[PDB]
C-alpha cells in the first residue's frame, strides 16, 4: 500500500537542529515530487519546502529560507529536512506529502503520511505538580478532578482509580502558558451519594521526566 | 507575500449543500487544490485542478472556478463530511506554494446543548506553593463553541487568562476548560469572582469566594 | 496512450534501457505547468 512516514521529531531547544525523515513505500518514489508542510498546534497548514523527483528543484518557504535545507535518497525512497537555527514559532508536526506535478487522475499533494512532532523552547523536562479538584444533594452529580500543572514537554496521561473509574472521565488538552510550561486537568462526574464513601484518586504519569503521581481527591473540610 | 482568502468558519445542516470560496491573484493561471482534514488526522485530497475529484472521493463533493475565485461545494452535507478544509495553490511564478487559513465546516448533527459549569476556587495545597489557579470546566455543550469572560468582583478580567478549545466527550458532546491564574493576595483581597461562559446567545455563570 | 501510476504517460526517468520504453515516454517536466 502506498504509505508514507514521518520520523525524527522530538523536543530541542532554540538554535539547535534537527534532522526529519520520511520514508515511502508502495509507489515509485523517483517520479514524485515531495513536500513537507508544517501545522502549528491549533493552526492551518503551512508549507515548507518541495523538492523535485531528481532532487534538482529546491524551493521554500520564505519563514525557512536559508535554516532549512530539502533533500532525498531515491536508493532507499527517502526524504529528508535539515532544520538549523531552530526557532520556537517552528514548533510544529510536520508532515511529508508526494506530488506527482503532472498527475492525471490524481494531482497536488495526493498522499499524505502521519506526521512527526518537534517541539522547540528553552524549557527544561520537568514534571508535573498534582493538585485536588475537591467536590462541593438530592441524587445530584458532583465534579471532581486533578490539576496536573507546570509539566514539560507533553505528553501526560490521566486515569483514575487506576483504570477501573471510566464514566463520566474527561482530560482535557493541555495550555501552554507564558512561562513555557503546559498544564491540564481531568475531571470525572460520579453521584453525590458517594462522596462520603467512595475513594477517587487520579494516576498522573508524566514519562518523559519519569514522573509518576497518585493523588487522592477527598472533600473540603 | 501571495496569499488565499478563505473563511475561517461555515455552518450547515445535514442534506444542505456547503458552499466554501477560496479566492488569490494568480489563481488564473495557477491551479488550486482542496483537502479535507478531520481532528488528529493527516489531510485528504479531495479536489485536485479547480474541477477534478479523485476516485474514492464521493460525489457529493465538487469543484468549480470563476477566474481568481474558486468554490468547493459538498451537496447533501453528511455529519461525516464536518472537517477542516484548505485550499491550496501556487504563486505567479509556479515555484512557491500556498495554503490558504482553512475552513472550519460545522454539521449540525445533534440537537443543541446548553452547558454546565463548575468554578473551582484555589486548592490549599496550590496556595500553600505561593500560586493560585481558578478552574472554570465547561461540560456538556453542542455546538463546539464557547466563549469565557472571567470577572473580579463585578469588573471584567482578561490577565492571566487561558482557554482551550472544546473538544467532544465521550457521549458526543463537547467540553472546554478556563483557567485564571493569580497570586494568593489577589485571590484573599477580592469578595469573589465568576467564570462566565456564553454558549448560542445564552449565558451560564458560576461564582466563589475566598471565604 | 500508456498509464503509469497517477499519470497518463510513462515517465523517461523509468525507461533504463527498454528501448521501446524510450520511444512511447515522455519527461516530467522541470516546471509545474500553469493553466
Same mark, same amino acid.
Given at each position: 500500500?502506498?504509505?508514507?512516514?514521518?520520523?525524527?521529531?522530538?523536543?530541542?531547544?532554540?538554535?539547535?537542529?534537527?534532522?526529519?525523515?520520511?520514508?515511502?513505500?508502495?509507489?515509485?518514489?523517483?517520479?514524485?515530487?515531495?513536500?513537507?508542510?508544517?501545522?502549528?498546534?491549533?493552526?492551518?497548514?503551512?508549507?515548507?519546502?518541495?523538492?523535485?523527483?531528481?532532487?534538482?528543484?529546491?524551493?521554500?518557504?520564505?519563514?525557512?529560507?536559508?535554516?532549512?535545507?530539502?533533500?532525498?535518497?531515491?536508493?532507499?525512497?527517502?526524504?529528508?529536512?535539515?532544520?538549523?537555527?531552530?526557532?520556537?514559532?517552528?514548533?510544529?508536526?510536520?508532515?511529508?506529502?508526494?506530488?506527482?506535478?503532472?498527475?492525471?487522475?490524481?494531482?497536488?499533494?495526493?498522499?499524505?503520511?502521519?506526521? =512527526?512532532?518537534?517541539?522547540? *523552547?528553552? &524549557?527544561? +523536562?520537568? $514534571?508535573?505538580?498534582? @493538585? /485536588?479538584?475537591?467536590?462541593?444533594? !438530592? %441524587?445530584?452529580?458532583?465534579?471532581?478532578?486533578?490539576?496536573?500543572?507546570?509539566?514539560?514537554?507533553?505528553?501526560? =496521561?490521566?486515569?483514575?482509580? *487506576?483504570? &477501573?473509574? +471510566?464514566? $463520566?472521565?474527561?482530560? @482535557? /488538552?493541555?495550555?501552554?502558558?507564558? !512561562? %513555557?510550561?503546559?498544564?491540564?486537568?481531568?475531571?470525572?462526574?460520579?453521584?453525590?451519594?458517594?462522596?462520603?464513601?467512595?475513594?477517587?484518586?487520579?494516576?498522573?504519569?508524566?514519562?518523559?521526566?519519569?514522573?509518576?503521581?497518585?493523588?487522592?481527591?477527598?472533600?473540603?473540610? | 507575500?501571495?496569499?488565499?482568502?478563505?473563511?475561517?468558519?461555515?455552518?450547515?445542516?445535514?442534506?444542505?449543500?456547503?458552499?466554501?470560496?477560496?479566492?488569490?491573484?494568480?489563481?488564473?493561471?495557477?491551479?488550486?487544490?482542496?483537502?479535507?482534514?478531520?481532528?488528529?488526522?493527516?489531510?485528504?485530497?479531495?479536489?485536485?485542478?479547480?474541477?477534478?475529484?479523485?476516485?474514492?472521493?464521493?460525489?457529493?463533493?465538487?469543484?468549480?472556478?470563476?477566474?481568481?475565485?474558486?468554490?468547493?461545494?459538498?451537496?447533501?452535507?453528511?455529519?461525516?463530511?464536518?472537517?477542516?478544509?484548505?485550499?491550496?495553490?501556487?504563486?505567479?511564478?509556479?515555484?512557491?506554494?500556498?495554503?490558504?487559513?482553512?475552513?472550519?465546516?460545522?454539521?449540525?448533527?445533534?440537537?443543541?446543548?446548553?452547558?454546565?459549569?463548575?468554578?473551582?476556587?484555589?486548592?490549599?495545597?496550590?496556595?500553600?506553593?505561593?500560586?493560585?489557579?481558578?478552574?472554570?470546566?465547561?461540560?456538556?455543550?453542542?455546538?463546539?463553541?464557547?466563549?469565557?469572560?472571567?470577572?473580579?468582583?463585578?469588573?471584567?478580567?482578561?490577565?492571566?487568562?487561558?482557554?482551550?478549545?472544546?473538544?467532544?466527550?465521550?457521549?458526543?458532546?463537547?467540553?472546554?476548560?478556563?483557567?485564571?491564574?493569580?497570586?494568593?493576595?489577589?485571590?484573599?483581597?477580592?469578595?469573589?469572582?465568576?467564570?462566565?461562559?456564553?454558549?448560542?446567545?445564552?449565558?451560564?455563570?458560576?461564582?466563589?469566594?475566598?471565604? | 496512450?500508456?498509464?503509469?501510476?497517477?499519470?497518463?504517460?510513462?515517465?523517461?526517468?523509468?525507461?533504463?534501457?527498454?528501448?521501446?520504453?524510450?520511444?512511447?515516454?515522455?519527461?516530467?517536466?522541470?516546471?509545474?505547468?500553469?493553466?
Amino acid at each position: 500500500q502506498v504509505q508514507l512516514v514521518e520520523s525524527g521529531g522530538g523536543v530541542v531547544q532554540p538554535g539547535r537542529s534537527l534532522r526529519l525523515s520520511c520514508s515511502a513505500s508502495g509507489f515509485t518514489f523517483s517520479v514524485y515530487a515531495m513536500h513537507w508542510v508544517r501545522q502549528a498546534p491549533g493552526q492551518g497548514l503551512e508549507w515548507v519546502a518541495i523538492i523535485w523527483y531528481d532532487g534538482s528543484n529546491k524551493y521554500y518557504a520564505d519563514s525557512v529560507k536559508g535554516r532549512f535545507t530539502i533533500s532525498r535518497d531515491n536508493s532507499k525512497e527517502t526524504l529528508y529536512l535539515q532544520m538549523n537555527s531552530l526557532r520556537v514559532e517552528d514548533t510544529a508536526v510536520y508532515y511529508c506529502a508526494r506530488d506527482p506535478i503532472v498527475g492525471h487522475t490524481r494531482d497536488g499533494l495526493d498522499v499524505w503520511g502521519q506526521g =512527526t512532532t518537534v517541539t522547540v *523552547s528553552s &524549557a527544561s +523536562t520537568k $514534571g508535573p505538580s498534582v @493538585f /485536588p479538584l475537591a467536590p462541593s444533594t !438530592s %441524587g445530584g452529580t458532583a465534579a471532581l478532578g486533578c490539576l496536573v500543572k507546570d509539566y514539560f514537554p507533553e505528553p501526560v =496521561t490521566v486515569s483514575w482509580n *487506576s483504570g &477501573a473509574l +471510566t464514566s $463520566g472521565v474527561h482530560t @482535557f /488538552p493541555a495550555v501552554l502558558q507564558s !512561562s %513555557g510550561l503546559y498544564s491540564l486537568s481531568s475531571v470525572v462526574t460520579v453521584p453525590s451519594s458517594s462522596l462520603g464513601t467512595q475513594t477517587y484518586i487520579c494516576n498522573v504519569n508524566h514519562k518523559p521526566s519519569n514522573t509518576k503521581v497518585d493523588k487522592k481527591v477527598e472533600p473540603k473540610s | 507575500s501571495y496569499e488565499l482568502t478563505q473563511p475561517p468558519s461555515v455552518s450547515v445542516s445535514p442534506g444542505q449543500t456547503a458552499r466554501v470560496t477560496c479566492s488569490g491573484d494568480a489563481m488564473a493561471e495557477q491551479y488550486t487544490y482542496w483537502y479535507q482534514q478531520k481532528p488528529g488526522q493527516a489531510p485528504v485530497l479531495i479536489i485536485f485542478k479547480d474541477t477534478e475529484r479523485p476516485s474514492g472521493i464521493p460525489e457529493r463533493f465538487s469543484g468549480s472556478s470563476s477566474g481568481t475565485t474558486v468554490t468547493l461545494t459538498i451537496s447533501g452535507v453528511q455529519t461525516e463530511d464536518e472537517a477542516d478544509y484548505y485550499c491550496q495553490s501556487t504563486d505567479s511564478s509556479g515555484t512557491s506554494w500556498v495554503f490558504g487559513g482553512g475552513t472550519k465546516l460545522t454539521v449540525l448533527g445533534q440537537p443543541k446543548a446548553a452547558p454546565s459549569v463548575t468554578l473551582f476556587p484555589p486548592s490549599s495545597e496550590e496556595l500553600q506553593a505561593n500560586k493560585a489557579t481558578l478552574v472554570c470546566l465547561i461540560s456538556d455543550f453542542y455546538p463546539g463553541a464557547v466563549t469565557v469572560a472571567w470577572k473580579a468582583d463585578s469588573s471584567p478580567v482578561k490577565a492571566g487568562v487561558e482557554t482551550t478549545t472544546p473538544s467532544k466527550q465521550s457521549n458526543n458532546k463537547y467540553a472546554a476548560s478556563s483557567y485564571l491564574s493569580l497570586t494568593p493576595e489577589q485571590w484573599k483581597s477580592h469578595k469573589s469572582y465568576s467564570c462566565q461562559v456564553t454558549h448560542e446567545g445564552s449565558t451560564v455563570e458560576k461564582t466563589v469566594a475566598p471565604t | 496512450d500508456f498509464h503509469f501510476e497517477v499519470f497518463n504517460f510513462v515517465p523517461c526517468s523509468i525507461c533504463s534501457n527498454n528501448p521501446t520504453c524510450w520511444a512511447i515516454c515522455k519527461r516530467i517536466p522541470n516546471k509545474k505547468p500553469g493553466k
